[PDB]
């Protein structure tokens, strides 16, 4: 049951936009809402509006009086001397709650005229006509206007609606909540050479009487929220999908072949999401818009998605096809379960984020294989256990503070840190995988189909929300639908992993009792760390003995420590028979390293990742080597690679080398075995016999049979030896001699890989392989032996580093004339120049990176150069570079770059709270408090980034470096 927090119900909204002026960056328009009051004596009506100048408001064609105030413009007063962050977080939460449409509130308060009170008490319709104007928007609509001359379509100027969550208040007045569903009528009067893309279906396109402008009329009969309404106006090249004909793809001019190749996969994503769920795609059209200077890499609205143009690749670009493919896939998953089925509160957001991430993981499983699915699930689980042990924990479904261990309030999406938002979505889809583990996948897809079917029976009624609230899901409704389809309720699993905000830590060690033939496990939990919680459920453990692989369920109550499980025979060591594996197959194992008295070959605690856990198991090194070689699970091979770094014995070198030589191993395991072999080789110097590690293996796999030092000409058509070939010198460059310097046998090998590179014969590009070659050249740089702080000049350069510097100069200059796909070699060469500057080789001068961080460059070059400037101002304690970065945060045209500068200055801070630095003035505290209070008031993501930066630099209490 859904009861509105608003005293009115909104039925229909007309959004008309005229006079989109690109020179002046200005729009004019009106908005006409059709509300039905649910309570008599409505009097004031409270709507949401930011940055719009409200000209006039007429209610039922009668002139009404409005008052506007935004408390989130300046959160705390300018003349308050408070400088602690808990004060700002409480004031910011109160300010966002005072404009919240999820309460009854709002920023624009319109007073109902007196003569309509007899129209409002007996509950009859009210039609509110606001007309507004955006004079030069700092948020919401982003105007990308290039400085080439010509007409606005000839130079490539466009507008798009940017922002996250409820940010539609930034470009027209609305009820900007996900729970106020209404039908829509959208008119946009644009130039005759431009096209206006929006939500709904385009009913017509009429000309103006001078035929210089045309009006696009859109209609949206599926009741969506105001937060799902978008806009993209530009000189877009239109491409109808040749497979599905209601799907149109819009790109920027001159990028039509890239659009043709890139969006050619999307029909398979549509077919997948419509056959695992049994509902068809709910909207009547689908539109993909590719734009420049995007807010996020992929945004999903109702019947529309806005991607950045940096996803567009051609047919000869690999290492970008899977990333763009999965961006399209998660946009479509959010089309199903973020835009059609919406949110009932700010709680129950974990339901939608979990269903979107879970069905996108099912797509990844079918498309890229179960092994890529397991690797992705393991990397997401490692991400969340790292974040939750780092700071507190992520609390899905809080109850309204519920989480006081962290420096922001979790009551609203616009007060969350961006890393918390990312980990929120990550934990939501892992908890949905856990619900699939308890209640099987076919019942899970039946739950999702029941939600979609209730929403689509709801979506066709005309009753104003008598039935339109069946399109809003809640937690209680989701659990009730689960209990309807399965008969089991998941309330212990919901109580543990949703309502409780923690992950578990397992420390395991075994001992084999030879007398009674049992395996005594010893599993203890660390439950006193700040991020942890105590697990009391069951726990699966998989033991591989000589007779095969056996699963055991252990009951781990609070007082439990020793778990005795039984062991089988050892009669497959009496005769040589094959040892049967986890799957149905069996292999020949070399049992010379195994103990004579124990049959068990390896043990895995929680193999299926059925809890949110971090396992620290103490096996013997031969058990880790057997688990690396003969396991049929990629997460166990990865964890054995990760645990073999502590055992540098030559049997582990043989194990990793046999993994590296082995095709029919998953390629991301061999790419990890490269770096593990490099670390082991560095640890057993003065024992290593022959050549450096992986060199003979590289010449055996990727070089000519007649010439060992000449590499084969590039043929990248295998896509697994391409990735292994481009990752093996990067790990090989981490080799070090007894003198702690990279050997001149590996550096010469990398330089010969660079010289003899011929790419005139493959059908694929070479930009990522050459960029990884520059990364391998950067990995070999050891710190220089400066004497008496000698100035680093050209004559006293290292003889090794002069070759590296010549190569990166040649590569960067050739990129200036023949550019790569996304300037990957510019990014790699800037990263390598920063590596050479971090050691004492090149003079520590930020002027090159400051010239590459200007506005007109590509955004990857910009963020690489700004990363180099952030690293410089951390190491050299530069005041003027920090003022340069803070000025670039305040006034840069691209808001993604501002968010990225705040992000990089949070990750690599110039000082922490513990450090005494020269950059701990009252002036810097006043600048960052002014940046939290004012200055970042237009983005909701820059303000949370400024809160994160103030927390990283000065902590939760009063800045110490202050009177």
């Amino acid at each position: 049951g859904f009861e509105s927090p608003r005293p009115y119900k909104l039925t229909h909204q007309v959004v008309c936009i005229n006079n989109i002026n690109f020179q002046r960056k200005s729009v004019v328009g009106f908005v006409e809402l059709t509300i039905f009051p649910t309570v008599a004596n409505l009097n004031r009506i409270k709507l949401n509006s930011k940055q719009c100048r409200i000209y006039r408001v007429r209610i039922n064609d009668l002139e009404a009086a409005f008052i506007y105030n935004d408390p989130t413009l300046e959160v705390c007063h300018s003349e308050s001397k408070q400088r602690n962050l808990n004060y700002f977080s409480n004031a910011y939460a109160a300010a966002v709650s005072a404009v919240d449409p999820d309460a009854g509130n709002g920023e624009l308060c319109i007073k109902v005229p007196s003569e309509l009170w007899k129209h409002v008490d007996e509950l009859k319709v009210l039609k509110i006509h606001i007309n507004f104007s955006l004079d030069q928007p700092k948020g919401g609509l982003h105007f990308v206007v290039p400085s080439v001359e010509g007409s606005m379509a000839e130079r490539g100027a466009h507008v798009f609606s940017c922002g996250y969550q409820n940010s539609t208040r930034f470009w027209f007045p609305c009820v900007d909540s996900y729970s106020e569903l209404c039908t829509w009528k959208l008119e946009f009067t644009v130039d005759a050479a431009m096209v206006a893309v929006s939500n709904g279906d385009l009913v017509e396109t009429v000309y103006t009487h001078d035929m210089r402008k045309k009006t696009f009329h859109y209609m949206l009969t599926i009741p969506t929220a105001a937060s799902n309404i978008s806009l993209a106006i530009g000189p877009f090249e239109i491409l109808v999908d040749p497979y599905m004909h209601e799907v149109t793809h819009f790109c920027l001019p001159q990028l039509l072949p890239l659009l043709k190749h890139t969006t050619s996969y999307l029909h398979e994503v549509f077919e997948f999401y419509e056959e695992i769920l049994t509902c068809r795609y709910p909207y009547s059209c689908f539109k993909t818009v590719f734009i420049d200077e995007a807010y996020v890499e992929v945004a999903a609205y109702a019947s529309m998605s806005i991607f950045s143009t940096n996803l567009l690749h051609s047919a000869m670009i690999i290492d970008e096809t899977p990333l763009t493919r999965r961006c399209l896939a998660q946009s479509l998953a959010q089309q199903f379960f973020g835009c059609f089925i919406s949110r009932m509160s700010w709680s129950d957001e974990w339901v939608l984020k979990g269903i979107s991430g879970y069905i996108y993981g099912l797509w990844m499983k079918k498309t890229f294989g179960v092994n890529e699915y397991r690797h992705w699930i393991k990397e997401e689980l490692d991400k969340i256990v790292a974040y939750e042990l780092k700071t507190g924990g992520v609390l899905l479904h809080p109850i309204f503070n519920p989480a006081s261990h962290l420096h922001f309030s979790i009551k609203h999406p616009h007060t969350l840190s961006w890393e918390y938002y990312s980990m929120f979505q990550c934990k939501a889809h892992l908890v949905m995988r856990l619900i699939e583990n308890r209640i099987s996948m076919e019942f899970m897809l039946q739950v999702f189909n029941k939600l979609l079917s209730l929403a689509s029976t709801a979506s066709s009624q005309k009753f104003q929300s008598h039935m339109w609230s069946q399109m809003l899901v809640s937690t209680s409704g989701f659990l009730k639908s689960i209990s309807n389809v399965s008969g089991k309720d998941i309330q212990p699993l919901i109580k543990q992993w949703v309502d409780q905000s923690g992950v578990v830590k397992f420390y395991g060690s075994f001992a084999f009792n030879r007398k009674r033939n049992v395996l005594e496990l010893e599993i203890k939990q660390d439950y006193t760390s700040p991020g942890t919680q105590k697990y009391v459920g069951p726990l699966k453990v998989t033991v591989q003995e000589l007779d095969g692989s056996f699963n055991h369920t252990l009951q781990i109550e609070e007082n439990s420590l020793k778990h005795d499980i039984p062991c089988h025979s050892k009669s497959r060591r009496n005769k040589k028979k094959k040892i049967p594996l986890m799957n149905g197959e069996e292999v020949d194992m070399d049992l010379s390293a195994m103990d004579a008295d124990s049959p068990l070959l390896w043990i895995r605690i929680d193999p299926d990742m059925s809890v949110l856990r971090k396992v620290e198991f103490e096996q013997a090194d031969f058990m880790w080597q057997y688990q690396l070689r003969y396991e049929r699970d990629v997460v166990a091979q990865q964890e054995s690679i990760l645990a073999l770094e502590k055992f540098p014995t030559p049997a582990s070198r043989l194990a990793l080398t046999d993994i590296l030589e082995q095709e029919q191993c998953f390629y991301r395991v061999r790419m990890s075995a490269c770096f593990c072999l490099a670390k082991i080789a560095n640890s057993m110097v003065s024992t290593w016999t022959g050549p450096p590690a992986m060199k003979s293996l590289f010449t055996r796999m990727f070089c000519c049979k007649s010439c060992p030092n000449i590499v084969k000409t590039n043929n990248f058509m295998s896509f697994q030896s391409y990735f292994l070939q481009k990752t093996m010198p990067v790990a090989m460059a981490l080799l070090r001699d007894v003198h702690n310097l990279c050997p001149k046998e590996v550096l010469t090998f990398i330089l010969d890989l660079i010289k003899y590179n011929d790419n005139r014969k493959n059908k694929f590009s070479d930009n990522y392989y050459r960029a990884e070659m520059i990364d391998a050249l950067a990995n070999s740089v050891t710190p220089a032996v400066s004497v008496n702080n000698e100035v680093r000049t050209l004559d006293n350069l290292n003889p090794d580093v002069r070759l590296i510097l010549e190569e990166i100069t040649r590569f960067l200059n050739m990129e200036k004339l023949l550019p790569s796909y996304r300037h990957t070699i510019t990014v790699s060469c800037l990263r390598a120049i920063r590596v050479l500057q971090k050691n004492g080789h090149v003079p520590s001068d930020p002027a090159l990176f400051k010239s590459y961080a200007e506005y007109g460059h590509f955004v990857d070059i910009r963020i690489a150069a700004l990363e180099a400037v952030v690293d410089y101002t951390k190491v050299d304690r530069s005041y003027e570079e920090l003022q340069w970065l803070l000025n670039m945060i305040q006034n840069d045209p691209v808001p993604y770059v501002r968010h990225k500068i705040l992000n990089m200055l949070t990750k690599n801070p110039p000082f922490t709270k513990n450090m005494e630095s020269p950059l701990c003035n009252e002036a810097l505290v006043d600048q960052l408090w002014k940046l939290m209070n004012s200055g970042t008031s237009h983005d909701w993501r820059l303000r949370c980034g400024a809160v994160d930066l103030y927390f990283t630099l000065f902590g939760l209490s009063r800045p110490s470096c202050l009177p």
Partner: peptide
């Protein structure tokens, strides 16, 4: 750009 998960060797059915 493709499957690249050697699935027939890890999960044979």
């Amino acid at each position: 750009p493709w499957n690249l998960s050697n699935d027939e060797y890890y999960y044979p059915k």
